Amino acid sequence: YDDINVKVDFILLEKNMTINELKMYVENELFKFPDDIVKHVNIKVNGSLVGHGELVSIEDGYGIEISSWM
Amino acid sequence: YDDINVKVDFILLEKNMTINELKMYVENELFKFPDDIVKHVNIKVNGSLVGHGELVSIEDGYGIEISSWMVK
């Protein structure tokens, strides 16, 4: 079983919004969100939520720090 | 039929790995994305790839500028 493969998703943000709302964002070429989402990244394995995450600035690039795990 | 509600995901990375490999992930660990990680966010609606965006800092907030959108 630990021989098989799964997909690990580092999800910056999930947000619910109408097809209408979504479409406004596509018109404005920008989704606009009030801060924070860099601190609260979620790490799901095909729906099952494993841990939390934080996007950090390191080595002249980016990385993730595992704030929570399960 | 546009006032219907849907689930949009802003996805930084999908890593395929064994549950064995997945064991090699621990708490307070630190991983290293590539440098194209903020410039290649995948935008998903109900699990469907509808485009790609770039994460930017803005005033008091963060936003995802859209670089490609794959549906109309």
Residue numbers in the entry:
A (entry chain A): 221 to 290
B (entry chain B): 221 to 292
The authors write:
Non‐flagellar type III secretion systems (NF‐T3SS) are essential for initiating infection by many pathogenic Gram‐negative bacteria. In particular, the protein Spa33 (SctQ), which is essential for secretion and localises to the base of the S. flexneri NF‐T3SS in situ via association with the basal body (Morita‐Ishihara et al., 2006; Barison et al., 2012), has been proposed to form a substructure termed the cytoplasmic‐ring (C‐ring) (Morita‐Ishihara et al., 2006). In this study, we show that alternative translation occurs to generate full‐length Spa33 (Spa33‐FL) and a shorter C‐terminal fragment (Spa33‐C) within S. flexneri, with the production of both being required for assembly and function of the NF‐T3SS. High resolution biophysical studies demonstrate that Spa33‐FL and Spa33‐C associate to form a minimal 1:2 complex that then undergoes further oligomerisation to produce elongated arrays.
The 2.3 Å resolution crystal structure of Spa33208‐293 was subsequently determined by molecular replacement. The structure shows a SpoA domain that forms the expected saddle‐shaped homodimer with an approximate twofold rotational symmetry axis. Regions of notable asymmetry have high B‐factors, suggesting conformational flexibility accounts for major differences between the dimer halves. Indeed superimposition of Spa33208‐293 with T. maritima FliN (Brown et al., 2005) (2.18 Å RMSD, 126 Cα atoms), Yersinia pseudotuberculosis YscQ‐C (Bzymek et al., 2012) (2.09 Å RMSD, 135 Cα atoms) and Pseudomonas syringae HrcQB‐C (Fadouloglou et al., 2004) (2.40 Å RMSD, 133 Cα atoms) shows a remarkably similar arrangement of secondary structure elements. In order to gain insights into the interaction of Spa33‐FL with Spa33‐C2, the intermolecular contacts of the Spa33208‐293 crystal were investigated and revealed a dimer–dimer interface formed by an equivalent surface of each homodimer, comprising regions proximal to the N‐terminus, C‐terminus and β3‐β4 turn from one chain and α1 from the other. This interaction buries a surface area of 508 Å2 and is stabilised by three hydrogen bonds and hydrophobic interactions between apolar residues that are conserved with SpoA1 of Spa33‐FL and orthologous domains. In particular, Tyr221 makes a significant contribution to the interaction, fitting into a hydrophobic pocket formed by the interacting dimer (Val265/Val270/Trp289/Val291 and Ile239/Leu242/Lys243 of opposing chains). In contrast to the closed tetramer of FliN, the Spa33208‐293 and HrcQB‐C assemblies form an open lock washer structure, with the concave surfaces of the saddle‐shaped dimers being offset laterally by ∼ 55° with respect to each other. Indeed, a continuous spiral of Spa33208‐293 dimers is observed in the crystal lattice, providing a molecular model for formation of higher molecular weight oligomers by the analogous dimers of Spa33‐FL/C2.
